[model samples]
Target: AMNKIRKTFQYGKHEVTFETGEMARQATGAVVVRMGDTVLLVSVVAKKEAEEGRDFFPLTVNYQEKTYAAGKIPGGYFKRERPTEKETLTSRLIDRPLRPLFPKGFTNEVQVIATVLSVDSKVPTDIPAILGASAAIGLSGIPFNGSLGAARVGYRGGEYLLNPSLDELKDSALDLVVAGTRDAVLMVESEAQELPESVMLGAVLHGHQAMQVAIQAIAEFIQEAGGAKWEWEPPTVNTALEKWVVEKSEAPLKKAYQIQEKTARQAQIQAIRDQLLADRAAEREGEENAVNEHELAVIFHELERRIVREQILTGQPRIDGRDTKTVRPITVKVGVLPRSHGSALFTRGETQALVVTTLGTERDAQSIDDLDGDRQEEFIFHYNFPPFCVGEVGFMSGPKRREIGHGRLAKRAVVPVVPTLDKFPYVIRVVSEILESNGSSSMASVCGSSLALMDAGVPTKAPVAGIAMGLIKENDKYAVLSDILGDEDHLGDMDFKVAGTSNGVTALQMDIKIEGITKEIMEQALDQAKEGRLHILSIMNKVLDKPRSQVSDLAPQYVTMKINPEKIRDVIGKGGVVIREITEATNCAIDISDDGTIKIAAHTTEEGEAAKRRIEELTAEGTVKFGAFVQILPLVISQIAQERVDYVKVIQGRVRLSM
Candidate 1:
């Protein structure tokens, strides 16, 4: 039997809808859903039994968007819609709420697919996709513990907008997404205006509570749609790996907790671990699966921390010979690399990062593609944390997830201060190489990145700073560690990262080891973080209080000009030959973009100016053509405000052209 239920909500010129008991009637359960004018059909599926030998839960959610949803066809490069940053982020959102709803030990092969069938520009489709996934699974007979709800909260006009339109979000101070059940919030992803922790957390709780109506609506819809909830299978416990790893490292783990000198203690613990692993290898003799061995390594790493951490709580001590609130000493250095356009080195406690900045013309900007359409990045940032940064040597490879996350944190810290194109036109790139680190390289990156921009004569709007906090849960108690170390970060639960200017926070990210954290604890962490961040800023200012009066010697100089939008086509003729010819004659480099922003890059002041003069001639005022026609006539007349030139030429049978 096919049964169905749905809810439709409207705002402004848009209409959004959510429905269940539709098409995916074939699988465990499914829902055909729509938001505004967009449509998404989501289905939940699973194998009857779990995949043998799997240690982690295989719950996968795939969100596939079709171009047809937006009433368009794919073209050029991809010729079809593909997973974009928005899709990836949305996939993460859908996964977050559904993930915690699953039973602790359930490890069946679960797959949830969200497919976009239609899209209208006004339709904010992400929220619908999330709700439908859980709703479908709840009724799919796949043993899913979800029929969750979600909402988008935007802060504006001193009031919170429950589901603000995209236009409203542009001027809003807060844009947050909250999702979960009636009991508690499952996930909170938000961007705010340095609001107090209490207020931000309240917004989350409020949003969660506000969405209960929708959650209940979905539940009722599912129940009405011929619901089918099935019995679940047993979980596969990781007894073998846990048993062997705990037994082998039990001795070294105990010894690691006994020593606490920060430096010498780390070395001793590592030695013990190495010897234990070596002994395991020598006795086994038989070949070991490299894959399984890697698994064992992960297991050992986790067990070491758990076992050591338990002792610290029970023993009333720490691994680094410091109280939970202690912070590391810091030193800031600017202009460390003379040849680079900008450079800075930030050393905190034991961690350090050598950062360099580069300046370029508009052509250097990054191109971004997403569901919102294509955009460009005027600034770019790259980060690298070598394995050797922690005094461990390993093969060098591409960036990991941690690197991307850190780079974004640094960007958030510095971006709010970067000058707009009208003030500073150069494209900026900042790179941070972690030379030595134990904890919080990314926070150091925020400080170093700002100095680097200053060294490049960026003239940022304000100075920026960053801080990272850690938390350790003891027996019925917890301690929030400030300026944490590698050991604490590994053994701890929360890695709360915050970056800001002296005025307010620009960006923040918090991830934890446990299920959830209370608002009160989050507030304490934020307050402590602000204090540590302020101290770091003072040290940085000691090195350089402001941007240099001028750009660096090695940095390229740029010349810019504005041309008539109508004349842009003729300014660069015959495959960019007009601009290319000017560059060669002036003995300089020139780049022309579609936006009428042409840049001339030169090593010297004279060359830069000369290049500019040449480009002007190439785009200067030109008069009418004999027997020529223009849609917007009279546009040929030059403004009296402009420096105009004139010329008249007669060639072959043509009467002439004049400017």
Candidate 2:
């Protein structure tokens, strides 16, 4: 027998309930959250001790969606579930907000797992998953400063709706999720349809306000079922060692930051730290007061962080010698690759991306299976980051979480401007290869992807550009730095990335390292990022202002046609024999939809035309009068025959009559 505690609260139109203590008894904490028909089970486990030689916290958040949750079986040959894009993105979403809430220096290994036990078509699982994770960890007596809440806001007409359904989202202009504690917002991820800054901000504010109920509910649940707080203290810092480290390295660190080149500046900074470590070791050798190397390294890095933050707080130039509001220099080149359908090389100071766009037939569209059911995605974006891009040598493997998240962000940034499938009638794929990077390479991908799409003759609604803004705050004073460098991002309090066109924003993502931030700070960051985005767009527009008048000759030719739903069988023939013959004869790919839409793709216009002509003849109605010598079935007589048939079809240059 087990004691089960439960807490329920009304959020939006649904009643959210959190229950625990009867399942996963061995885990540190476990909670089940229910809303509408959706149910999520979240379990958290933390190791008692940190791993040796581990300098950073190891916290993993995994969000899994089981097929049984949706009353469906797995489709793969293995009949098992694997992580999909939605799961990966949602895992990151759950990780980002909870990560900053953990107390600094508490580096014990921790894992949070959110599993969807059941799903509702009307209620989203992500919010429940996040809430469950928060509650489970809160009840586990972890050293966390959280009781955070998450809400999804949708903008329809002129108003915002809290936790809108999937159907509502289809008609909404904005889909945004805001997560935070009671006092301030910590993370935001959103996609909009070229909405203005005020609307985007309003959505964030609305979501933050609406999530208070969730925060209150979690607090109550934790109060009832939570265990005593863990007896943990941050590692003590030696005041004398810290003071010595600052005195020894502050001036030289400042000098190192003054260098404009990324590689040189980094090398010099590393050299300074290495020298300090070696000298300290030699000075304390064979003495009672021996220096702890790990402590020394930690203090040295803190000194560096303070120097950078103080520089920005005092309105000093950034590491690359740029003012707070200035973006790095940019260079744009289109048609950089000879054989690619569309290609562009976009370089913004130290960061660069080689983006290419490839157009394909509808058959090439990606079929995605998830909790929302199956769907076809025609516009695909891939972001690849190789070690050489950062001047390092390492193993090359599949895309990591960062890559997936960045790719999704960049894709969201450009999705609004991309032409619809009906208008373009071609599957579009954009790939961004990071050639060099210092900071904001993902934003570079957005800029380069836009250029590549335009060069490919895609009739986009508008060109999109992205910029990353950083914040450095010390109590009352703070600086909102635009187009941040790698170092600035590392030491900065916030990373606010905004993407939009000249008219408005399309996508925005914000992550705060500090304990949340005020709306005033977010407003200033958004405004600054807008200015940076416009500056980058102007430079990009100089290279290519609009889509080319013609598509690349290297790209395949596409033709689309419609036929009666009942006539589909005529084109497909028995066992797909007719369609296969057409493909073989014309060397083209054909995709037919259930709604009687047909698409043909070929290497040349002649091939596409031939395929289209054959399909048209096969699906054509009425009678055919052709004077030709033919033999009747079961008869050996040859004569000039004029056949009256309900339909005339052609396959492999042979004519057939259908009645």
lDDT of 2 by residue, 1-659 (tens): 79999998899999999999888867789999999999999999999888777778899999999989999998777889957888999999999999889998889999999999999998999999989998999999989999899999999889998998888899998989889998878899988999998899999999989999999999989999988878999988889878878888889998887887879988998999888887788877888658666787788878888888888788778876789999989999999998888999999989999999998875577998778879889998999998998999978878878889998999989999999877887789999999999989999999999999999999988889999888988787888989888867877888889999999999999988885467787888899899889999999999998998988888888678888989999888899999999988887888889878997887678889999988887767223224432322211012223443211222255444332
What is the Å distance of residue 81 in model 1 from its true position? 3.5
Global lDDT scores for all candidate models? 0.71, 0.88
Whose lDDT is greatest here?
Answer: 2
lDDT of 2 at 394: 73
Where is model 2 poorest over a 10-residue stretch in terms of lDDT? 629-638
Model 2 pairs in collision: none
**lDDT of model 1 at residue 372?**
49
